[PDB]
Amino acid sequence: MFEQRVNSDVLTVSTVNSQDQVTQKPLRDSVKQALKNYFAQLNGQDVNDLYELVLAEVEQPLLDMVMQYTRGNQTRAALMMGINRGTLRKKLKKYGMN
Amino acid sequence: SDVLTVSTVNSQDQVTQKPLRDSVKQALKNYFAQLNGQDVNDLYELVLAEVEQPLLDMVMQYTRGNQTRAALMMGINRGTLRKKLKKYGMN
DNA sequence: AAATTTGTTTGAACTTTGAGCAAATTT
DNA sequence: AAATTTGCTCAAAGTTCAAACAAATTT
């Protein structure tokens, strides 16, 4: 057959391990790391917009990368992400990618 | 100046931060590399799923389970948070 | 000159929100 | 015993959507 590829390992980054060998951990794990790192560096300072902070840090490069792929075609890009053409264009405005 | 970041090692064994947005690119760069014009259909709800999950995973761990502190921390409604927790089944 | 995409608008379908309250749980 | 948090449900506020369709651009 084909071999399973869990959604965990659909999107993946390159890491180095204890034996200095290149392996591919999930993006999940990068996100986890970053948050662990963000809390530790926080020091009892108040936070109240973590969702939008993360979302910004993820939408931008998804958009960046997807528009490169469709050589700048929105209809394709929006179809490709699964979102209305108008909201893509709204998101794009928000980060100044138009 | 950039708050969301991850650690990296160079060949000369030095650790060093880089923004998470640089990871997300790589992932996508890689996702697209390994497709070969196979249609992609629902990519926004995919990455979102791969980012919501460990964000919820970590903020509950941080707020010791406190749904209320968690929502307030994330800047979303207390009900939205319940719904997202059903979505990935983290009851 | 043919097809396809942009840039808009419209209204309907859906989602998030703030508040309210009893009942359960933590302090 | 007091304070806070859960689990719910209403409504209003806000976003996403598909569909139009000229006007611009690309095949």
Curated annotation (Swiss-Prot), chain A:
Matches recorded under InterPro entries: Fis_DNA-bd, Homeodomain-like_sf, HTH_Fis, Trans_regulatory_Fis
GO biological processes: chromosome organization; DNA-templated transcription; positive regulation of DNA recombination; provirus excision; regulation of DNA-templated transcription; response to radiation
GO terms of molecular function: core promoter sequence-specific DNA binding; DNA binding; DNA-binding transcription activator activity; DNA-binding transcription repressor activity; protein homodimerization activity; sequence-specific DNA binding; sequence-specific DNA binding, bending; transcription cis-regulatory region binding
UniProt keyword Protein biosynthesis present: no
Keyword presence, Cytoplasm: yes
Cellular component terms per the entry's GO annotation: cytosol; invertasome; nucleoid; nucleosome; protein-DNA complex
Region (Required for the stimulation of HIN-mediated recombination): 17-44
Regions recorded as binding DNA: 74-93
Subcellular location as annotated: Cytoplasm, Nucleoid
Entry keyword set: Activator, Cytoplasm, DNA-binding, Transcription, Transcription regulation
Annotated Pfam families: HTH_8
Assembly, per entry: Homodimer.
Family that this chain belongs to: Belongs to the transcriptional regulatory Fis family.
Function: Activates ribosomal RNA transcription, as well other genes. Plays a direct role in upstream activation of rRNA promoters. Binds to a recombinational enhancer sequence that is required to stimulate hin-mediated DNA inversion. Prevents initiation of DNA replication from oriC. Binds to hundreds of transcriptionally active and inactive AT-rich sites, approximately half its binding sites are in non-coding DNA, which only accounts for about 10% of the genome.
NCBIfam families on file: PRK00430.1
The protein's name in its UniProt record: DNA-binding protein Fis
